[PDB]
Amino acid sequence: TQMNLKYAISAKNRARTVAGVSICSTMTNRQFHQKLLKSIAATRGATVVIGTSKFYGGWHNMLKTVYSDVENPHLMGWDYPKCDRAMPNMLRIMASLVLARKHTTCCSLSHRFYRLANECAQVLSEMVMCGGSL
RNA sequence: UGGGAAAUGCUACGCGGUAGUAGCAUGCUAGGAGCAG
Ligand SMILES: [Zn+2]
């Protein structure tokens, strides 16, 4: 995985970073996961709001769907300090397990395990080329 | 002795096809830009 510095505008001098991934990983991941990702992005009015425009009154519909029948409602929100740098890898494994539950028929058992192994070898913990070294 | 067809032109109507013109909606593609995590 190659690492690079960003070039954008922000309100704190801490640096930002992007990471490019090799091509074979992207090809195989697209083929394995694309259908579910599209299905998630298409569905409207659910718990996950990825793919819902904030234009044309979509924002109002989201804010109304969350405001379902709650007797004494209040509003609550929180913040994760260093979410990307500090997520314990057990939860990442479990997250990658949930997304793969859809593959009951398109894949066997050993195929599922090897797909999980490739994912952990390519994205979870592997060799990062920063500067000029590994 | 209470029996009539066709070839021509005009007009009107409808259909079909052709072309050209304008409008509408969409589907694709390409390009450029902006926002968010
Ligand atoms: Zn599969």
Swiss-Prot record:
Residues 43-81 are annotated as: RdRp Palm N-ter. Inhibited by Remdesivir antiviral drug (GS-5734) through non-obligate RNA chain termination. Signal peptide: none annotated. Zn(2+) 10 binds at residues 103, 106-107. Its cofactor is Mg(2+). Residues 6-16 are annotated as: Interaction with RMP Remdesivir. Residues 82-134 are annotated as: RdRp Fingers C-ter. It catalyses: RNA(n) + a ribonucleoside 5'-triphosphate = RNA(n+1) + diphosphate; a 5'-end diphospho-ribonucleoside in mRNA + GTP + H(+) = a 5'-end (5'-triphosphoguanosine)-ribonucleoside in mRNA + diphosphate. RNA-directed RNA polymerase that catalyzes the transcription of viral genomic and subgenomic RNAs. Acts in complex with nsp7 and nsp8 to transcribe both the minus and positive strands of genomic RNA. The kinase-like NiRAN domain of NSP12 attaches one or more nucleotides to the amino terminus of NSP9, forming a covalent RNA-protein intermediate that serves as transcription/replication primer. Interacts with nsp7 and nsp8 to form the replication-transcription complex (RTC): nsp12, nsp7, two subunits of nsp8, and up to two subunits of nsp13. Interacts with nsp9. This is RNA-directed RNA polymerase nsp12. It comes from Severe acute respiratory syndrome coronavirus 2. The gene is rep. The chain holds residues 4932 to 5065 of 7096 of the full protein.
